[PDB]
Every structure is written in C-alpha cells, then in structure tokens.
Design a protein around this ligand. Sequence first.
Ligand SMILES: CCCCCCCCCCCCCCCCCC(=O)OC[C@H](COP(=O)([O-])OCC[N+](C)(C)C)OC(=O)CCCCCCCCCCCCCCCCC
Ligand SMILES: CCCCCCCCCCCCCCCCCC(=O)OC[C@H](COP(=O)(O)OCCN)OC(=O)CCCCCCCCCCCCCCCCC
Ligand SMILES: CCCCCCCCCCCCCCCCCC(=O)OC[C@H](COP(=O)(O)OCCN)OC(=O)CCCCCCCCCCCCCCCCC
Ligand SMILES: CCCCCCCCCCCCCCCCCC(=O)OC[C@H](COP(=O)(O)OCCN)OC(=O)CCCCCCCCCCCCCCCCC
Ligand code: SF4
Lengths: 257, 105, 115, 175, 98, 80, 70, 96, 156, 318
Amino acid sequence: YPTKETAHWKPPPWNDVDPPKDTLVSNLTLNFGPQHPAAHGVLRLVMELSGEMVRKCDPHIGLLHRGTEKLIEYKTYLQALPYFDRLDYVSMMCNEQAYSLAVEKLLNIQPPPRAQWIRVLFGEITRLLNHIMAVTTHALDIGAMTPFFWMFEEREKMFEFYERVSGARMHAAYVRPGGVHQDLPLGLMDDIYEFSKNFSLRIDELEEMLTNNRIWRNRTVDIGVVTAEDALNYGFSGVMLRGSGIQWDLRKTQPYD
Amino acid sequence: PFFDVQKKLGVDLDHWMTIQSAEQPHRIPARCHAFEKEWIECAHGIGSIRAEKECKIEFEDFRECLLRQKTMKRLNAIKRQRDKLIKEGKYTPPPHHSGQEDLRP
Amino acid sequence: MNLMITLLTNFTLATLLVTIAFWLPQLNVYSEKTSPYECGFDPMGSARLPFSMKFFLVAITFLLFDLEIALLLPLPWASQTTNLNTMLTMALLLIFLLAVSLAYEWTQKGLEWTE
Amino acid sequence: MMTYIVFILSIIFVMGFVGFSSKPSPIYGGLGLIVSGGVGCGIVLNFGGSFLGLMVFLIYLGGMMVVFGYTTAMATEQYPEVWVSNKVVLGTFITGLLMEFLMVYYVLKDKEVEIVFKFNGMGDWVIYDTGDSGFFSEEAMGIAALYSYGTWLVIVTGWSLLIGVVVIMEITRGN
Amino acid sequence: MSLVYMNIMMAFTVSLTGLLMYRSHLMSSLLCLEGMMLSLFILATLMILNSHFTLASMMPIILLVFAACEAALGLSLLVMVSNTYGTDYVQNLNLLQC
Amino acid sequence: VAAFLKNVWAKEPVLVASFAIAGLAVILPTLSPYTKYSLMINRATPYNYPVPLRDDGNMPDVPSHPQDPQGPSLEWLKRL
Amino acid sequence: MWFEVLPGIAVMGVCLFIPGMATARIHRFSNGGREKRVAHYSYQWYLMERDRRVSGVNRYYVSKGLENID
Amino acid sequence: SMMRWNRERRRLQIEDFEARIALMPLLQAEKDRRVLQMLRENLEEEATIMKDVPGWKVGESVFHTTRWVTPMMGELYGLRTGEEILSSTYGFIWYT
Amino acid sequence: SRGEYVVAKLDDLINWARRSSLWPMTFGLACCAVEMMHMAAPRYDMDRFGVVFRASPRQSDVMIVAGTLTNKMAPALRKVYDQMPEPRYVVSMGSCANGGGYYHYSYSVVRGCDRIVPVDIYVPGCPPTAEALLYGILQLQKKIKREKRLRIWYRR
Amino acid sequence: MFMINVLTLIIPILLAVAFLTLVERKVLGYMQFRKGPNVVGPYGLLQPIADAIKLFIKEPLRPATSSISMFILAPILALTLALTMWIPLPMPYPLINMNLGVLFMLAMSSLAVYSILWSGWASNSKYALIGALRAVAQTISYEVTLAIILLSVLLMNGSFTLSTLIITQEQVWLIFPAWPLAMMWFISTLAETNRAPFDLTEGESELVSGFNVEYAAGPFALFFMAEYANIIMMNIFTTTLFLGAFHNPYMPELYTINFTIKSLLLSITFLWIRASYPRFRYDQLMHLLWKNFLPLTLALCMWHVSLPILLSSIPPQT
Ligand SMILES: CCCCCCCCCCCCCCCCCC(=O)OC[C@H](COP(=O)([O-])OCC[N+](C)(C)C)OC(=O)CCCCCCCCCCCCCCCCC
Ligand SMILES: CCCCCCCCCCCCCCCCCC(=O)OC[C@H](COP(=O)(O)OCCN)OC(=O)CCCCCCCCCCCCCCCCC
Ligand SMILES: CCCCCCCCCCCCCCCCCC(=O)OC[C@H](COP(=O)(O)OCCN)OC(=O)CCCCCCCCCCCCCCCCC
Ligand SMILES: CCCCCCCCCCCCCCCCCC(=O)OC[C@H](COP(=O)(O)OCCN)OC(=O)CCCCCCCCCCCCCCCCC
Ligand code: SF4
C-alpha cells in the first residue's frame, strides 16, 4: 500500500548487492618541508598518504635556485669558475675538473701531464669525501649516527689537504682551464700517504658496524628497487646504473685526463 | 527443553559452583554457609510451591544473612537516637567508647 | 592510606612545576607563534582528518591475546593445588589454544598489514 | 568522612559514567571510561580483591587505548564536541550530575532511600567481617581454583576465543 | 542494602540510558556498552567478595573475557561499516526500510 | 623428514626451537617419576587447622599425640 | 681520558644510594630499632594488632617479653 | 640450583605453618572472649540510649533462630569512634 | 643597597644558564651547512659548550642561518623564526646570509637575511671555517652574558 | 614520618635523572670519538643545572588550535606516572610493601602510554598524530610479550611480591635458568621505554620531534624527566628480576650498593645500545615481537609451567 512516506522506497536489487558508492577517501597531505633533518636542506615534498603508505610524492624544488647560469653569462670564464664549486659543495673539485675540461676542449689546448695527475688524484680525494658524506648521512637518516662522527675526522683531514694545497677548506678554486693554479707544497704527498694507509681500516670499521647489522639490512634489502630499463629511461647515471646491473662507467668508457 | 545431560552421563560441568555451600579450596566457608545449608535441606524434594510455603522462615532468615536489611535498620535506629540524645544533652558516652580502656588481650 | 598520600605528593609535585612554568617568564604571544608546525610551510588541510590505520586486525587480536594472558596470570597460585594433573592439563591446553589462534592468523596472512 | 571512602569512590565512578554516557566525543569518552575503570578498581580494592581490580584496570586500559587508535582512525570529525561545544551534551551532563548529587543529598539526610530497591545511609564498612582469612587471599585462591575445578569453563572460554579470532578474521575480508 | 550498591546500579542505569539514545556515533554506543559491562563486573565482584563466595571469584574474569570478545566483534563490524560509507554515523544504516 | 627438518632449521630456527621446547614440556610430565613427590609436597602443606576426631574407642590408626608413632610422617620430605 | 665521565657516574651512584639507605634508616627508627613488620596476609595483621593491644602504649614495636607475666 | 632452593623453601614454609597451627587455639580463645566482651559492652550501652523509644526491646535478634551467628562488623564497632573504624575495617587493606 | 645586588645576582644566574645551554635548530641550506656540521665534528665538538641540536623550532633557542636565502625560502624562514619561543637569537653564516655573497645581483636571492629576521652575530666567510663559526657562537655567548634585563626592570 | 620518606624517595630520583642526562651526553660524546660537556663546570658537573634553569624561564607557548585541557594534563600525567612507578621497588625495603607489585607496574605501564597519546592528540598537529599512532602500535606490539615473559619468570618465584624476588635467588642468580627470557625481557623493556633501536615516537628523522613537536620548554622537560625516570626504574626492575644480590638484614647498605652498581651498569649498557644500532621501522617492530618472540614465549611458558611439576620444585606462595 503506497503512501506519502513510502514514495521514495525503491525495491532492493535482484542480487542484493549495491554499487560501492565510492566517496573520496581523503588522503592526508603531509608537508615534508625544508625545516626537516630528513630533507637535505631545502626540499618541499608534498606527500599524499593513506595513513603512512605513500600514495603520491611531489618534490617541490627551487628553494635554492640562485640562478647561477645567468650570472655565469654575465661574467668571464675565470670569474665563472668559482660558480661551479657551489653547485655540488661536497664534490667541488670534480665540478672544477668538468668545467676546465669543457673550456680546454673549446680552446683546443691541453694541460701538462703533472696537472693531469694532480687533477685525477684530487678528484679521487673528492670522491672519498663525497662517499663518506653520502654513506654517513644516509646512516644518520636511518638512525645510526656513530659512523658520521667516526668518518668526519677523516673528512677534516682531507679538508686539511685541500687547505694545504689551495688555502681554502672547501671552495678551493684550484683546478682551472689550462691545468691547476698552483703546484703542490713540499711534504703534502707523504701526509696523503699516511692518510691513505689508515683509511682502509677506517672503511673497515664503518663496514663492520653497518654491512652485517640486521637492522641495517631490513631497511635496505628491498627498498627502492629500480629495474635496468627504467634506470636507463629516467636518465639515471652512475651508482644507480651500476647497482641495477648496468656495466657502465665514464672513467672506463669515455676516459679523461 | 531442559535436556539434562549431566545426570544422565554422570559428569558435572557447573554443579560445583551453583551454590554457596559446595566444596571450596581447603574448605574456606562462606559467610552464610549454615543458613544456605538449612534452607537447602528444608526444601529438598518437596517442590517449589511447598518450598515457598513451608520454608519461608528459613529462606527469609538466609536472605537477612545475605543482604542484612534489618541489622542495619536496627543500627540506624540506635545511631539516630544516640545522635539526638547527644545533641539534646541527656547522654554522655562511656570512657570505653571514647578511645582507651586498656583493651582485653 | 600511605598510597593516597604518596599519589597526592607526586601529583602536587608534578602540578607545581607546570604552574611555575606558565606564570614566571616574560611572554610575547602573537598570532604567528602558536600556529601549527608543518616544517615551515602552511598546512594543506586540518589535523583532525581521518588518519587511516592499517593494523586493525592486529589491534583486535591484541585485545583477544591480552584477555588470553589475563586468564593466564593465576598460574603461580594455581600451581599450589592438589589436583595437579588437571591443572597442568588445563594450563597446557589454554596455552596451546593461544598458539593455535596465533598460528591460524599467521597462516592466513592476518598479521600482514593492508596496502 | 574517611569512613565513607567507598562512597566517595563510587561518586567519582558515577561522575565518570555520566561524563562518558553523554557521548561528547570518543576521545573524552575514553578518558571518562579510564577514570571510571580506575576508581572501580579502587572500590573493589577496598573491598579486598586487589587482583580483580588490577586485572579490570589493565584490561580496560588496553581496550581503551586500542579504541582510541580506532577513533583517531575512524570516529573523528573536523570540530569534535569535546564538551560544552554542543547543547544537548552539556544539558544531559548537567542533568545527570544534578540528579546524582540530588540523590546523594537525599541519602545523606534521611539515611534511607527507596529507588526500586531500598538503600541504607551509612558507609559500607558495617557489612564487613570481623574474622581473619588466615594465610591465603580468597579471590586469588578462587581464580587459582579456576584451573583445578573449572575445566569446562576453561574449555568453553578457550574455544570461544579461538573461534572469535576466526570470526573477526573472516568478517574483515571484503568478499 | 548498602549505598555502594545504589551508586553501582545508578551508574548502570546511566550507561543504559546512554546506550539506548544514540548521538549519531556508533563508537560512543560501543563505549557505553563497555561501561555497562564494567558496572556489571564491579557489582558482581562486590557482592562476591562481601559474601565470601570464594569459588565464584573465577566468574568475573570470565565475564570480562566475554565482554572483550563481544567488544572486538563490535569493532570489526565497525571497520566494515566505515569501509562501506564515509564515516561511522548510525543514520547511514537505513537501507533496510523499504 | 630429515630434509624438511634441515630446511626448516636453515630458514626459521626460532619456530623449530619453540616447537621442540613445547613438545618437551608436553611429553616430559608423562614420563618423569618426580611428579608424585610434587603432588605429595602440595598435599602435605598445612593451610587449614587439623581438627581432631572424637575418640569413640575404635580408632587405633589415628594418634593421640603429635609425637605418637602412628600417622602420616614427613621423613621423605627431609630425604627426597 | 675515559675516567672523566666517572664524576657523573659516581654522582648517580650516590644519588641512587640515598633513597634505599634513607628508607632503611626511617624503617629502623620509626619501629623501635627493628625492621618494619611485613603484613602480607591477615594472620600477620591480626598478630600485629595483638601486639598493639598487649603493649599498652598503642605502639606495637614496644615489645613485651615474658617478664610481663607473673 | 633452583630445585634445591625451592624444596628447602617449601620445608621452611611447612615449619612456619606448623608454628601458626600450634599458636591457633590460644588466639581463638582470646578472639572469642574479646568478641563476646565487645558485644556485651555494646548491649549494655544500648539500654541506656533506648529508654524513651516505644516498641523497642533490647538485645533483639533479627534472625528467627537461636543459633549463634557471626557478629557483623557494624554490630561490633557500631558505637565506637572512627579511628577504631578505620583501624579495624580498612586497616589491613590500607596497611602499606 | 640590597635590591640592586639581588637583581644583579639573578641577572648573572639567568645569563649563565641561558648562555651555557644554547640549543640551535637543525637548519641549513647550502655549503655553510656542511661547514656547520663540520664544526659539530669530533675535532671541534660544540657539544662541549652545552650546544646541542634540537630539530623542532619550539625547543630551540638560537637559529643559525647558513646558506642562501632565496625568494621561495623567505616565508618559510620567517615562519620558523616566528614559531621559536622567546628568547631567541639569530646567527648569520657565510656571505650568502650576510649580504647575498656571490648571488647578490641574482633575481631570486634575498640580499642578506637581515631583511627578514633580526640578526645578532654576523659570521663572515665563504664558507666561514669551523673555528670561525665556533668563534661566532662564543661571541654570541659573551653577548648574552652582557644582558641586564632584571637590572633594567628594577631601574624602570 | 612518611612524608619525609616520600620526599627522600622523590627528590634523588629526579636528581639522578638530571645526572643521567649528563652521563648520557658524556657517553654519547665519548663513544663517537669526541667529548661531552666539559666547559660549564669542573668536568661539566653543572650542565644539568643550566639546562634545568634554562627550560623554566622560556616561553610556555600553548597553541591556539590545541585543546588546552588535555595539553596541560598530559605532561602532569607523564611525570606523576613516572614518579609513582618507583614506589614498590625494594632497595632492599620498598616504600610500600605490596602483595601484587608486578601487576601494579604492568597497570601503570599501561597508563603511562596515555600521556604520550593525549599529548599527541591535543596538540593539533599531523606529526603529533603520527607519533601517537606509532606509540599505539608499539604498545600493542610489546605489551602481550612483556606480560607473558614476566608471568613465565615469576612462576619460579611463587608470588607477585617483589621482596620475595630477593629471597628466591639468594643462592644463584635468576639469569641462569631464564637466560633466553632475560634477553627477550631486555629487548621488551628497550621497546617499552621508547629508546633506540625502538624509538619510533620521538623520531628526529622520520618526524621532527614526534608527539612533543609543539611543546616548548618547561612542559617538554616533564616528558624528558618522565622518560629518564622510566629508563632508570626499568633497569632497576630488570636488576631485581634477574640479578638479585646478597641481602643482610642487619646491614642493608650492602644490598643497596650491590644493587646500585648493577643498575648503573645496566643503564650504561642501555646507553651503549643507544649509540650502536639504526632505528627499526614501526611495522618491523610489530613483526618482531609477534613472529619471533611470542611463539618462543608460549613454548617457554609451557616449559616453565611443566618444569616445577617436573622437578618437584614448586616455590612457596608464602
Ligand atoms: C639484561 C641481561 C642481558 C640481556 C641480553 C641482551 C643484551 C645484549 C643486547 C644486544 C643488542 C640488541 C639490540 C636490539 C636487537 C633487536 C633485534 C632482535 O634481537 O631480534 C630478535 C631476533 C630476530 O631475528 P631476525 O630479526 O633475524 O628474524 C628473521 C626472521 N625471518 C627469517 C622471518 C626473516 O632473534 C630472535 O627472535 C631470537 C630470540 C631469542 C632466542 C633464544 C633462544 C635460546 C636457545 C633455545 C634452545 C636452542 C638449542 C636448540 C633446541 C634445543 C631443545 C632442547
Ligand atoms: C607438538 C608440540 C607442541 C605444539 C603446540 C605448541 C606450539 C608452540 C609454538 C607456537 C607457534 C605459533 C606459530 C606457528 C606458525 C606456523 C605456520 C607459519 O607461519 O609457518 C611459516 C614458516 C615459514 O615462514 P614463511 O612462510 O616465510 O612465513 C611468512 C613470513 N614469515 O613455516 C615454518 O617455518 C614451518 C612451520 C611448520 C613446521 C614446524 C616444524 C617444527 C619441528 C620441530 C621439531 C619436532 C618437534 C616435535 C613435535 C612435532 C612438530 C611438528
Ligand atoms: C638575598 C641573597 C641571595 C640573592 C639571590 C642570588 C642567589 C644565588 C644565585 C645563583 C648564583 C649566581 C651567580 C652565578 C655565577 C656568577 C659568576 C659567573 O658568571 O661566573 C662565570 C663562570 C664561567 O665563566 P665563563 O665566562 O663561562 O668562562 C668560559 C669558560 N672558560 O661561571 C662558573 O665558573 C660557574 C658558574 C656557576 C653558577 C652557580 C651554580 C649554578 C646555580 C646554582 C643555584 C641555582 C640552581 C639551584 C637548583 C635548581 C634546580 C635544579
Ligand atoms: C582527569 C585525569 C585523571 C586525574 C587524576 C589522576 C589521579 C592519579 C592517577 C594514578 C593513580 C591511579 C591508581 C589506581 C588504583 C591503584 C591501586 C593500587 O595501586 O593498589 C596497590 C595496592 C594493592 O594492595 P595489596 O597488593 O592487596 O596489598 C595490601 C595488603 N596488605 O593497594 C594498596 O596497598 C592499598 C592502598 C589504599 C588504596 C585505596 C583505594 C584506591 C584509591 C584510588 C583513588 C582514586 C584514583 C583515581 C585514578 C584516576 C585515573 C585516571
Ligand atoms: S656563503 Fe659561500 S660557502 Fe656559504 S652557502 Fe654561500 S656560496 Fe656556499
């Protein structure tokens, strides 16, 4: 018997199963902003999460956009040389080497052999500095802070080498187009030899405290797996390619000095 | 449908708990074990109608052991009359109810 | 009686330090100091939104296992009985039923988190 | 006044019950039920059963924290009516508190009230016992005798809990 | 009887009127249900400890065990309800009216 | 069944140890002979008061003094 | 060297030495030169109040020997 | 080692329980006499208070039997001061 | 008399307790952040002086601006400075935070962080050495020691 | 003279909390190739005083979007729960002798979580709610295994009384017949006290400062001394459980000094654990106490139920 109240009463479905009526689930949008020890200085990760599983990451960058490559155009080559120290402030001398190699290729001149050997040796020293900072800061982000203080003494020793050879601890402005700015002071290579003698044991104790710990393994065994094809397609280079199984290295395939 | 299985099979599942006068761990007696014993033995095998007619005295005495209505009622009467007598001024408490009397043991 | 004196002493020790931490120093309160902290930027929505939880099944079985261990705590007194074989059998059977429930959850992927 | 200790604990018990039975917000309902569980543990501890009070306190604290996680996941809104934020919640809280204090004043004046049963006016120290318990605690020995007497109770409780795990796992399946 | 019984049953009646009048939140009614079971626990153990029924001391543990089991069942049903609709409001359970 | 035991000890040794410990705890009170001594120790603990029986005249087994020879003694609890 | 933390460690040592020794001395003073009675069960409580009643000082640690009797 | 020490502790526990059992009759006699004396003191003062109230009979038992019942806590300490109330009723539970 | 003596002693006490418990927040942007955490290395070890990092702005005392302050960063820096409870102190590190440094004429670089926050100590260099930053921290401590807040209150 | 006893219990524990902050900062300096605070005073003995005075003259900073009642109530509850935690601990005589002290610690361990939860909820922050739900998950991970470990250990004691735990191991240490239970107990109290590698609540890397990311000075110090009192008493609880010392009723100071040295060494090992390992995930911890500790604990509970029946070694309950 239909009435006024029983006017919108539809019959139930034949299978008694309703459509799911999917309302918006209201994912929480967190802001992993720049004032955060996890973000490397300035990184505004706008992060859409379902509680804690990540659904979307949008890293807003440009908070450290100084506009280097316009002031470079407004200055000469020697004046634009210190601009390359401050791009990668923990791999400065390799940036100096890249800029010098580009300018030397454009100028059709080559450095002397001693400048080349000094360049390669100090590039390896800079690689040591960068890898120390990378591994120790990754461990500090995970939670193990002892290797950071353990190897930053060695980082201070290589900074002392930088200051002895150039007069500045970080931004040396030492590798220039045409070679290097100054010759090595006397007695530098012996101290390099002592430091290289002990650094194997330093790496050994860092590895012993990190590479076998099951808490360290659980945070790294199946995290951020990248296949080889997407590593090639996304423009990944270096350690990502070599860790995904791609046998690629610029020091072996397209060699310099 | 009280399909009584326990007496048919000979096992007991909740018979040891159902009354206050059953077997206890190292024979700890309840407060009204004797009254429950008297009421239970008064009204065994006579049915519920004859239980409420012919064991009213035992049951009401047991119920007074359980909740103690009349005991606190008499205590309330004594307490109220003593307070009114104290307030009016016709009574003084004895020294052994005041705090010291060189107690017995 | 001594426990309530101890609890009250602890409570008025705790509330004395808070009350002297709110009225003593000089205050400069503005409509920027008390904003929520979102790593330097303005938040995108409220903090009272539904924060969805993935470990709901583990919480429900935490209730059930908390009650299982609540049943299990009379064991030091129950070891002082005379019917020792029946007590031992019921203790073992209760713990075995707890382990059976845990194993059934383990084999059915109940402990694995959703999404 | 100190003879009315269980009376004061029961008045805090009813105060928490009417605080959380107004249903303001399940966070504050959780706080109210935590208060009620703690003071109920207190009440049953002055009656002698310390083990039972500690168990009910521990069990309710665990359950209340899990359900707090649930309402932070599920039962929450933009502006939770914590208290005083809604008219009906404040009205029913005040109504319950006024009714409770009214009957407390009534029983502390006539020393006898009749709501459907009949309740006496003195403290509950009168209904205690003057004897000793010897070298054992009655409640601990009863729950110890759960294992040696109550085998059927153990069987039905364990089976109910195991199938309860099965029930909750086959409920949250989705298909 | 004693006035502690008055307050315990009065708390039970408060939580009973709380459960039977909904406030558009199912979880609050679940909390009222746990309040009622807590009141039953307190009342039972008060009389059991007063009358020295020592064998009945195992009972309120079992009662609270089944209380928590039915609470867990209620929470699971609430997960299903909140996974169907946006929220846990009791007015959304009105499909069975036609 | 030896290959399965080797595999499960190679993969999850904690579950193997737990299963071994639980099996040990289940099957040891059946075969051990010291449990009856525990039963008698629990039985011989005097929680209550040993109320005496009225001497009708025919009860020579029950003693009349705690230092009488007849009755249940606890020498085995001293020796064990 | 590594023994310069030992000032703070020794300060923690005496700070944890303080409360236990304080409770021991307070228990030994407020109970007539003896250990505090431990009343776990009601039999011990009844005995303690029995001493409280026989002592006649309303202080149970005042202990009457067999010289009280005739 | 734990087995040896636990068996020794059980022997010591049995010795303590035997000492308590030997002490029981004297304490029971004093408890009976103290309870009866306190009931007689409460009854003798009950007549002095109840003189004006009509329809009252002193020493009335609320039970229908002549069997001796255990004295209620309020039937013993009903007329005494609150210090004894707190010392007897809640005294053991509150004691530390 | 006696009141000036009492407020001078109280000023000395609170100045010592504030200058010996500086908690800087974990805040860096650029090269100068690497030099700051090289000051926190075991060679110099600012934890000796009671100086220990605290990541949240609510539990920090001194803000160290180390790096280049761009236009996209200035509202975030200002907000984080505002959420820091009183008393708060600001130390400027490097030429970027001092006056823009290399990128003074850049279109998207704030010429000095003093346009945004009130700065107490300016530490010059590019990067200033770890000894230079420790010198700046000790200068800030000595500046805190010379505060006469309760003396000013008593005189006013 | 009970109030004097209460004061002489509650003042030295917070003094030792401040000096534990000193010692922790010094050890956390000295393991990582550097020094601790040694500038403020003679070998840095005045650093906790300076920290304490500094935190009580800073701004209180109650947020506008936060519910003020629970915001103020939570640190009071945290400090009071840490302070009443210490009451039945026998050193060698507890402040309050209790028949069931172990269940009192368990109930107050359940209650102390609520301070963290309500401080996370009241401060209207997403990071605070994240820290609160991580605390919830941590509690539902550890609590069952903690209670059942303590149950299966106390079966050889005979009762829940802590003073009986001195007598029950006066011959040999209780760490010998329950060494696996000792290790899982140590891990469970590492997880209970929110210390590394199971921090997961005050994470300075996944979050900024956790549930107290909005708490300014003063109220934040309440959580600091609450946590440090928690770690000291939990090491003391472990020392009483497994490392009981020789007790002379005529000279209690021998037991006090033995117990104090053992608990100090346990706290040194606690800070040693702090500066050695990376932090877990908050779901890897849930798969640790459930998939690895709980089955072995159920097996050990079967073993420790059957074993006193096996060897006729049932301890007295008196
Ligand atoms: C207080 C006194 C001292 C306490 C001891 C501990 C002090 C030293 C602490 C060291 C640092 C610890 C830092 C935190 C570490 C947290 C991680 C962790 O421990 O995880 C647990 C780890 C977990 O291992 P996992 O994380 O590698 O798990 C792998 C899991 N799968 C395979 C699924 C990937 O270990 C355990 O769970 C073991 C628990 C203890 C087992 C004890 C067994 C005792 C022996 C039994 C018998 C054996 C013989 C054979 C059978 C015989 C039968 C008769
Ligand atoms: C009878 C003894 C008493 C029994 C009752 C008391 C038991 C106490 C212990 C309770 C344990 C509860 C949890 C059990 C879970 C078992 C199922 C399971 O989860 O297996 C998984 C595991 C392989 O791991 P995986 O598949 O990777 O798991 C997913 C992520 N871990 O799978 C495995 O590792 C294999 C599991 C099955 C085989 C175990 C064999 C153990 C043998 C020990 C020696 C013999 C002991 C004597 C008794 C016979 C036992 C079979
Ligand atoms: C009516 C009469 C009373 C009037 C009110 C005043 C009462 C006393 C107030 C407290 C003491 C006030 C004086 C404070 C120190 C004054 C002198 C001073 O500043 O000395 C500086 C000196 C360190 O020199 P610095 O410049 O740091 O050197 C670098 C290292 N080469 O510093 C040092 O060498 C060490 C300084 C230590 C300061 C004292 C110790 C700390 C404070 C203790 C008391 C307050 C706290 C009590 C407990 C609170 C709860 C924990
Ligand atoms: C709004 C937020 C909340 C704000 C207020 C917070 C208040 C403080 C909260 C923390 C404390 C909660 C305490 C809860 C009850 C704990 C009971 C307890 O500790 O019992 C231990 C002990 C057991 O005694 P037993 O082992 O039997 O030995 C005696 C035999 N001679 O017992 C004894 O030794 C007996 C000592 C006397 C006991 C008296 C009865 C208990 C008093 C409870 C007072 C109210 C507590 C309210 C807690 C609210 C928590 C939210
Ligand atoms: S001042 Fe120099 S060293 Fe510092 S951030 Fe700027 S460019 Fe880098």
